[PDB]
């Protein structure tokens, strides 16, 4: 009578539940698996993964965010690591795989503390304290470098460091040049802001990867309307239009009544005359080429050719606003409003033809100072093109941060080792049971040098121990792991550079994520 089956919750039998420590331990095991899957893909000697889509598409990639995005997961904690990776990618764009390894190794160190009888709020509080001590020391060893178009060598070195981890490294000296120049021709220095909508990345298969080049103009996937037009002009004055080359039509519902033969003939004359006035109106302004957003009629197409005037048909929306910025012209919605002050200028407009295919493209080049620019990517496989696009996007984002903040630190594990010693130094003065949390933080901060050494083929424990002792005897906080086997351990001489905000985001974001995982003690799932 006391405990006969009484229903409290809908579908009471089908729901499971985990309480207590067995809840926390299950989260730790799920978190560790994600970190061990992506431990391999860290550092210049890292390896890649080959994703497979729902339908069968193949994608080979090394970017941290994409792997966790294309992956399909079920465990709720796993989705929390996916959202952690994306947040870092949006804010910075570099350091997506480093953060999840730091976050994973930060949870692993907490398993022993939980077993020894520490309330996880004490652990969560301790991690927060350590991060604050680590961050304030991080910008004590920073070095402001430069932001100026005159030199551009420090900016190339930073771009080289980020590209050194991808398949683009085969020619990363060339690709670094393209990336830095693209930012500095769109960058607004006073507002300290760059807009990526003014940089168009387009790739076409075929050719060679080294054929990638920077075009300080616009490339469109179109051609001249009439097959017999000339394929190039050299003093193009650009007339950008928005209305189609057809007789007018009001939008409101309307009807025109033809009641006699003279009415019919007056309508027939009005048709053919209307075709003439638009083309006459274009030519008197001195324009050399016509660009339109909508189609042309058969009569209007030939008349353009008969007046020696090349034109383009059915261009896109975003393309038009780029050409207006690139060529410096203006957009007109009617023929009547066209003047000679609204035409743009262009040094060269050409149609470039590729090999066996019928694909043809139009390129606008050699204008004056341009706030718009495009990147052209070539390569022998669609999988290179996708990889080249993502890797180049990594380079552009890093340069953007140098615009925002112009001080850097030296990567290769030098920053992590130096930070860990500072945290460990502070841990010897805090006696209120929080010392154990701090030593666990510092030990989890060395997981990045371990991941670098293991991939390079050395022994982790020996290699880190020698480096840390040297940083104590000498006063050099710029010694890292010699992953490329060059002989020296000073990352300043080897020219390895990473931005400051990249590091501050990695540490601050991971610590705040653990403070949410460690705070969960219950779970309810419907069974399957």
């Amino acid at each position: 009578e006391y405990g006969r089956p009484f229903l409290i919750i809908k579908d009471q039998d089908r729901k499971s539940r985990l309480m207590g420590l067995e809840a926390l331990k299950s989260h730790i095991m799920a978190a560790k698996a994600v970190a061990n899957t992506m431990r391999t893909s860290l550092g210049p000697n890292g390896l890649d993964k080959m994703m497979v889509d729902k339908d069968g598409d193949v994608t080979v990639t090394n970017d941290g965010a994409t792997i966790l995005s294309m992956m399909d997961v079920d465990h709720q904690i796993a989705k929390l690591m996916v959202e952690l990776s994306k947040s870092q990618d949006d804010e910075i764009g570099d350091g997506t795989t480093g953060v999840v390894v730091l976050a994973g190794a930060l949870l692993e160190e907490a398993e022993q503390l939980l077993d020894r009888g520490i309330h996880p709020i004490r652990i969560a509080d301790g991690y927060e304290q350590a991060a604050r001590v680590a961050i304030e020391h991080l910008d004590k060893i920073s070095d402001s470098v430069l932001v100026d178009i005159k030199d551009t060598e420090p900016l190339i070195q930073t771009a080289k460091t980020t590209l050194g981890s991808k398949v683009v490294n085969s020619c990363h000296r060339q690709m670094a040049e393209i990336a830095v120049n693209a930012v500095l021709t769109v960058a607004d220095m006073e507002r300290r802001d760059v807009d990526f909508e003014l940089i168009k990345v387009e790739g076409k298969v075929g050719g060679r990867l080294e054929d990638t080049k920077l075009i300080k103009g616009v490339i469109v996937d179109k051609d001249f309307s009439h097959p017999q037009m000339p394929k190039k002009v050299e003093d193009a004055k650009i007339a950008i239009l928005t209305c189609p080359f057809e007789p007018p039509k009001p939008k409101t519902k309307h009807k025109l009544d033809v009641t006699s033969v003279e009415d019919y003939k007056a309508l027939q004359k009005y048709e053919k005359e209307k075709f003439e006035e638009m083309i006459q109106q274009i030519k008197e302004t001195g324009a050399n080429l016509a660009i339109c957003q909508w189609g042309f009629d058969d009569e209007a197409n030939h008349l353009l050719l008969q007046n020696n005037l090349p034109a383009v048909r059915w261009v896109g929306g975003p393309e038009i606003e780029l050409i207006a910025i690139a060529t410096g012209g203006r957009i007109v919605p009617r023929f009547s409003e066209l003047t000679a002050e609204k035409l743009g200028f262009a040094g060269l407009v050409q149609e470039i033809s590729f090999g066996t295919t019928k694909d043809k493209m139009l390129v606008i080049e050699q204008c004056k100072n341009s706030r718009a620019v495009t990147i052209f990517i070539r390569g022998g496989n669609k999988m290179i093109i996708e990889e080249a696009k993502r890797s180049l996007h990594d380079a552009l984002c890093v340069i953007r941060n140098l615009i925002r903040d112009n001080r850097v630190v030296y990567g290769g594990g030098a920053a992590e080792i130096s930070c860990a010693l500072a945290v460990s130094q502070e841990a010897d003065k805090c006696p209120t049971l929080e010392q154990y949390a701090m030593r666990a933080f510092a030990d989890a901060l060395e997981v990045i040098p371990m991941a670098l050494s293991e991939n390079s083929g050395m022994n982790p424990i020996q290699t880190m121990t020698e480096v840390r002792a040297r940083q104590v005897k000498e006063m050099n906080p710029a010694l890292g792991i010699d992953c490329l086997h060059k002989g020296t351990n000073d990352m300043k001489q080897q020219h390895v550079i990473e931005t400051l905000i990249g590091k501050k985001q990695q540490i601050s974001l991971a610590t705040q994520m653990v403070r949410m995982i460690l705070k969960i003690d219950d779970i309810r799932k419907p069974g399957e």
């Binding site: 006391y2 405990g3 009484f6 229903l7 409290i8 919750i9 809908k10 579908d11 709720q76 929390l80 959202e83 994306k86 947040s87 870092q88 990618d89 949006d90 804010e91 309330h119 509080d125 507002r191 802001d193 807009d195 003014l198 928005t242 007018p248 039509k249 009001p250 939008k251 409101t252 519902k253 309307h254 009807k255 025109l256 009544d257 009415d263 009005y270 929306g317 975003p318 038009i320 606003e321 207006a324 910025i325 203006r330 957009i331 009617r334 501050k504 985001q505 601050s508 974001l509 705040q512 994520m513 403070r515 949410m516 705070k519 969960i520 003690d521 219950d522 779970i523 309810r524 799932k525």
Partner: protein, 521 residues
């Protein structure tokens, strides 16, 4: 027998077995939210049918997400929304107090005591308990301006101690207080906008004394127009500025091509008239709920002026209240008064998105929060803790009377009832005594979660209160007792008073049930 009174499938139970089973049923509900109380409380993770997960510490939110069907347990769910809709803080306190009231009178029901005697007992102490709170509540009716800005901060921090953002409570409390003191004298909750943008640390959150919202869909030509102004004039509109057909009920019939060309030029002359009327008013920023065509944007580009369309309704009302204009559905009477003036306008990038900022208005009546997390559930949980701070300040403005928390108030009430039961004879002595015992669940649930010796601390607290130390509660960090009024642990008097009445009414209703009949389907 061959013709049965009620339809087949009707369930009917009654008597003491039915009533006791209801008491045990409410214990399960109070169990789901038990360990979510305290400076060292946890959260719970709930996943619905579709797979979406919700992480929350708010007590009222957890009970909603459970699919409770037990009729007696549903009473405890409703009182959670009652405390949620009136004071907004204390949704778990009113739940633990409800279950403890029932559990402490359960043996008397087994002995056969008449429930109407039990009901009279609860209603007697509640009027005594409520009248005790109002007597010993501390207030300063003299209007000092800096004390008010300190009292509200102490109340706000104490409401954030048990939340995910406890490590930054001192930073957020200053932001919340500043939000409310400039929100008119009716304090509409819609006058505060909370935005959520991914990426960034928690300390990167900011408060803008103005209006900021998301970039909307823009047509070709949006990118050749300036994105910064110093003294612009804002023209708010509710008119669709694009080339279109006048009326859906219109129709044009015409005979000659001469009128045909005149009609075609008539639509353009209409559109250019409105846009010329706006440009002559001297406004630089134009906002409209309705779409803005590409022709308008290209036209607005040629004169270095900014356009925006499809702005949400709520964001427009806040902009009007912050800038000081008015919405216009026509462009014929743009006087100098219907325009909005701001001290600077700009468009910036925030975590991958583009945001419009209107800052510098000295006569603003609206704020806006920009919250920076790392995941969707990280900022949603952040805003739920902010809402508890907003409502607490709103109540504290109307009545600035506070009492010391941390279990100090539950022991002063229990001691008072214990010293009053001994005066009256009969079964009214045992019932009030059992009532006074249920009030020390809050100090026990604080020590149980943290991990102390809950038995020893209660003995120390009970001796200090009866010695004559009114405001002595628990010390979480020091694992001891201490005065929480000099330790700055405050809460408005409304939170506790609304906690008792709702808890007492739920216990009385459930005990007063005789039998339950469930009919098929």
């Amino acid at each position: 027998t061959p013709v049965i009174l009620l339809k087949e499938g009707t369930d009917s139970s009654q008597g003491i077995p039915q009533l006791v089973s209801n008491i045990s049923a409410c214990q399960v509900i109070a169990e789901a939210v038990r360990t979510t109380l305290g400076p060292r409380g946890m959260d719970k993770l709930i996943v619905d049918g579709r797979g979406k997960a919700t992480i929350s510490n708010d007590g009222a939110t957890i009970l909603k997400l459970l699919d409770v069907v037990h009729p007696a347990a549903k009473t405890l769910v409703d009182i959670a929304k009652s405390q949620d809709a009136e004071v907004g803080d204390g949704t778990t306190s009113v739940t633990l107090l409800a279950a403890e009231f029932l559990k402490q009178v359960k043996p008397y029901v087994e002995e056969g005591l008449h429930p109407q005697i039990i009901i009279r007992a609860f209603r007697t102490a509640t009027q005594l308990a409520v009248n005790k709170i109002k007597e010993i509540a501390v207030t300063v009716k003299k209007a000092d301006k800096v004390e008010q800005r300190k009292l509200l901060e102490k109340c706000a921090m104490t409401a954030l101690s048990s939340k995910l953002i406890s490590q930054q409570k001192a930073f957020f409390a200053k932001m919340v207080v500043d939000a409310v003191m400039m929100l008119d004298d009716l304090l509409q909750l819609k006058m505060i906008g909370i935005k959520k943008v991914q990426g960034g640390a928690l300390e990167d959150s900011q408060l803008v004394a103005g209006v900021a919202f998301k970039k909307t869909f823009s047509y070709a030509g949006f990118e050749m127009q300036p994105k910064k102004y110093h003294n612009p004039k804002i023209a708010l509109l509710n008119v669709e500025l694009e080339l279109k057909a006048e009326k859906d009920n219109a129709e044009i019939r015409v005979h000659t091509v001469e009128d045909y060309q005149a009609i075609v030029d008539a639509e353009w002359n209409i559109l250019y008239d409105k846009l010329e009327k706006i440009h002559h008013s001297g406004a630089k920023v134009v906002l409209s709920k309705l779409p803005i065509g590409d022709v308008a944007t290209q036209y607005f580009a040629d004169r270095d002026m900014f356009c925006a369309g499809r702005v949400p309704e709520e964001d427009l009302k806040r902009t009007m209240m912050a800038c000081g204009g008015s919405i216009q559905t026509s462009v014929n009477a743009l006087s100098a008064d219907v325009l909005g003036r701001c001290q600077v306008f700009e468009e910036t990038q925030i975590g991958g998105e583009r945001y419009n900022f209107f800052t510098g208005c000295p006569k603003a009546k609206t704020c806006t929060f920009i919250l920076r997390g790392g995941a969707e559930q990280f900022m949603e949980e952040t805003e739920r803790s902010l809402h508890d701070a907003i409502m607490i300040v709103r109540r504290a403005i109307k009545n600035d009377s506070v009492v010391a928390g941390g279990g100090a108030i539950e022991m002063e009430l229990s001691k008072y009832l214990r010293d009053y039961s001994r005066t009256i004879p009969g079964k009214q002595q045992l019932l009030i005594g059992a009532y006074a015992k249920a009030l020390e669940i809050i100090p026990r649930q604080l020590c149980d979660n943290a991990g102390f010796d809950a038995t020893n601390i209660l003995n120390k607290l009970r001796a200090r209160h009866a010695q004559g130390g009114t405001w002595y509660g628990v010390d979480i960090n020091n694992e001891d007792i201490a005065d929480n009024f000099e330790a700055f642990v405050w809460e408005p008097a409304m939170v506790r008073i609304n906690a008792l009445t709702a808890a007492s009414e739920a216990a009385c209703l459930i005990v007063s049930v005789d039998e339950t009949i469930k009919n098929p389907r």
